Design a protein around this ligand. Sequence first.
Ligand code: A1INV
Length: 128
Amino acid sequence: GAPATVTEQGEDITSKKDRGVLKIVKRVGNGEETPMIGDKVYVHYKGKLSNGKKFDSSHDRNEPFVFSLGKGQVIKAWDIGVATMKKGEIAHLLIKPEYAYGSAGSLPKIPSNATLFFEIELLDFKGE
Ligand SMILES: COc1cc2cc(c1OC)O[C@H](C)CCn1cc(nn1)CCCOC(=O)[C@@H]1CCCCN1C(=O)[C@H]2C1CCCCC1
């Protein structure tokens, strides 16, 4: 599946090189610019537990998910991963618990020590 392909072929985009956040680019974006901390970022995404037991989609709102990068509005893996993406890019991320919800988890929706998978489309980003 997509998660196994990321485990085997995905690029380790963590500073520590601890394989906590693995990325495959699925569709190449436009320009060389990736967003800065503070930037308002617009995405579509699908996400799941790597077990597949809970599935979440911005598409089911029919509206993009918007957040400010690097302000801890999202799990650490998103601040790291979306920061590497270009306008128009689609990427897959596989995420160890340390860069998501950790040992505590986020019950009842996310269990302790959960690995997460996302597909993310970067639609746009705009300066603060
Ligand atoms: C732990 O709680 C949730 C996790 C996730 C979705 C959740 C959620 O309930 C708050 O439903 C919301 C209704 C969706 C809108 N949204 C985004 C965030 N907060 N709300 C941003 C903060 C929390 O989410 C995250 O940081 C990540 C990245 C951004 C998209 C959503 N994220 C998730 O972790 C999903 C999660 C993915 C795996 C399957 C279960 C849902």
